[PDB]
Design a binder for this molecule. Structure first.
Ligand code: JZK
Lengths: 447, 380
């Protein structure tokens, strides 16, 4: 079968190393594009070719569209993998890659635009039969009588959300008519300033939901499959801390119900590659909020429970190959837990950059370590706080948690502040040990 | 479960055992020589006891010192690992006479199987095929077993350990290439019946020579196998935790029909020795970096700044890669071997890279003489 000869890894850190490994397993030549502050990245040191695309600030490196495309052209690369974050959900970038004759390892640019606009995305999901949060089902105008009527029909509390927003950014809870006009007005102003798009919509506000998300894969040959779910509720201020697969309390019947709807939605929108349907789960019911049109950070928990290498599937799809597995070949087996490891201060939660003086990774049966860090490595201040991901699998949830506790005790990261101690606390939490804690749990636990 | 156990071993296996104990909530007692105070498992153990000076005869092979440490710490069981006293029937007999649980078979089974004459007679009786014959180009194929010593016994597929130097395994893999589900079931059932017939208790391995679609029994290792992780990857069974459950007097919960072979796993033994002359290379590891990724399993006590002592064997770690198929497991091993950094000492990492890149290994089914023919070494 035909495979991509050479690709540009348009990312950094752990995800860039994750992509480099998948490339090497498939015999794909790698081009590591990097900022001047990232010359010592583990994947840069393992890459077949390297191109320094600019200085440390992301604007002149990882978000630098001409420099990334120019690197693909000079090295003779055929495709670009955007990873997560940066330009991965940037439709202009995907269009420019397509326009320049290189393969964008993701969905069509118009699919990114469709799902990136939250109002259009909900309408497409509702039409496809995916359950959505009751809401305005269209943008809000300036007629406050019409806005009060939508709030009445939905039932308070409600949430005002930016169509150009996403991932908890660009939203405001409204509990009564008195706060409605000002809340809409503030959300609009914030959205205009942040996204240069003042469009807002209204949604029913769910008080105690769980964040449950469905993993999908769709090829260019008409196949679209669901790879169970992940529970990503263990979060703080919209930042995921712990993710797990499958989600506790989800039955095979409920898994089948939601998964089939997501797979059908892929067919209807002509989805291609890896994707994630994010839902709020409350009182046995799923409610769509948004679709992630790229690989997710927490993808490894899905890989452990299904045996499917999601990055290798992305590369295969992009090369024009069919999905390597059929739906009937996707089986949920055992349980996996992921602890994100951050170079962060436990009091401020702010990134804690610096030089790692001593480093030791955990090992053992069911223990997977996803990280670019090594002894002597300097965590730069220019980017996000995540330095690694510790993933533990077991035949059941109890075994996965037991292995995580042991793995966190072997993990040594000196010279910088980390959330390792917090991760140990979460694993020891009696409510986490029972499972099914909602999205507000971690914040309530911390204070 | 067993409240507290003495890990009567060292290095990677002692760390392997400690992790299984911690998962089950079993307290650990790390008995160590004065040269092994800095072993990773010793630093992670709940309690530690120095059992003597550096030579194994004075420490790891010192029965009164091990028993005394188990008595003073209030332990109830002893895991002997592999090597050392694991297959010493007098040690197993004394552990039990002292009132402790021996994490292994009965002393009589160790004796029965430890003597080739009585072992072969027990196998002929049990219906296990033996050497009737000249086996010029055989493959080393071995069957993993678990028996509770209560009448239940299961086989957990096979391993191919044909890549050898001076009769020491270098690469191991599971399942064995070319072994059909019919052949697996045939040999496996005879091994499970043999466990019942000899009253076997715990983990064990039946080693065979495999040539022209036929098995020929050589010997039984009456203990956990070094290469046990490749079987664990393909079955999902934690073999050390099963040893611990059996020793606690729990019957096997795993039924034969619950044992499924999925994917493929390869193990590369990592040795502190020269990759060409095989001169042992003890010494301080000045820089260390372990490989990572999907299907990558690293089994080692080594760390940056740790000194590999000159007193013991050269095996410092085991690199185990799994995949949905043999090709994926080999591709993952190549990637993992490139990430593995061990500086300050000589290792066989470069030899392992050559073995993974060998076209006959990539094809599979190379015989027991292959590695030495590739390297130009004379058998002895
Ligand atoms: N309808 C609601 O109750 C509701 C509540 C929270 C919502 C939520 C809905 N939707 C989102 N995110 C998407 C979004 C934000 C802003 C504008 C548009 C979108 Cl789609 N969030 C944040 C996510 C992320 C953190 C934990 C799970 C909840």
């Amino acid at each position: 079968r035909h495979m991509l000869d050479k690709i540009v890894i348009a990312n950094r850190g752990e995800i860039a190393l994750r992509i480099l490994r998948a490339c090497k397993e498939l015999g794909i030549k790698t081009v590591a594009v990097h900022s001047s502050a990232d010359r010592d990245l583990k994947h840069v040191l393992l890459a077949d070719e390297t191109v320094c695309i600019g200085p440390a600030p992301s604007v002149k490196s990882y978000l630098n569209i001409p420099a990334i495309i120019s690197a693909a052209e000079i090295t003779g690369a055929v495709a670009i993998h955007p990873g997560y974050g940066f330009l991965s959900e940037n439709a202009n970038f995907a269009e420019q890659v397509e326009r320049s004759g290189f393969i964008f390892i993701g969905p069509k640019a118009e699919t990114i635009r469709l799902m990136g606009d939250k109002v259009s995305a909900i309408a497409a999901m509702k039409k496809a039969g995916v359950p959505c949060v009751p809401g305005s089902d269209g943008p809000l105008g300036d007629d406050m009588d019409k806005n009060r009527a939508i709030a009445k029909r939905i039932g308070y509390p409600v949430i005002i959300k930016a169509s150009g927003g996403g991932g908890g950014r660009g939203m405001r809870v409204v509990r009564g008519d008195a706060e409605l006009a000002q809340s809409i007005s503030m959300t609009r102003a914030e959205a205009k300033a942040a996204f240069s798009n003042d469009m807002v919509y209204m949604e029913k506000y769910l008080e105690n939901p769980r964040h449950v998300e469905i993993q999908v894969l769709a090829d260019g040959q008409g196949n679209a499959i669901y790879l169970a779910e992940r529970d990503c509720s263990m979060q703080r201020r919209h930042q995921k801390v712990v993710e797990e697969a499958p989600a506790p309390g989800i039955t095979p019947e409920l898994r089948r119900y939601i998964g089939e709807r997501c797979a059908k939605a892929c067919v209807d929108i002509g989805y291609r590659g890896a994707g994630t349907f994010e839902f709020l789960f409350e009182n046995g019911e799923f409610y769509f909020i948004e679709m992630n049109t790229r690989i997710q950070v927490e993808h490894p928990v899905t890989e452990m429970i299904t045996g499917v290498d999601l990055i290798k599937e992305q590369l295969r799809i992009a090369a024009g190959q069919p999905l390597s597995i059929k739906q009937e070949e996707v089986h949920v087996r055992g349980h996996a837990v992921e602890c994100r490891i951050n170079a962060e201060d436990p009091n401020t939660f702010l990134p804690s950059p610096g030089k790692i003086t001593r480093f030791h990774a955990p090992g053992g049966f069911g223990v997977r370590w996803e990280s670019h860090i090594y002894a002597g490595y300097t965590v730069p201040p220019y980017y996000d706080s995540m330095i690694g991901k510790l993933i533990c699998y077991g035949e059941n949830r109890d075994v996965a948690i037991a292995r995580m506790k042991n793995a966190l005790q072997e993990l040594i990261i000196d010279g910088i502040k980390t959330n390792v101690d917090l991760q140990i606390r979460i694993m020891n939490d009696e409510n986490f040990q029972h499972g099914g804690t909602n999205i507000h749990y971690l914040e309530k636990k911390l204070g």
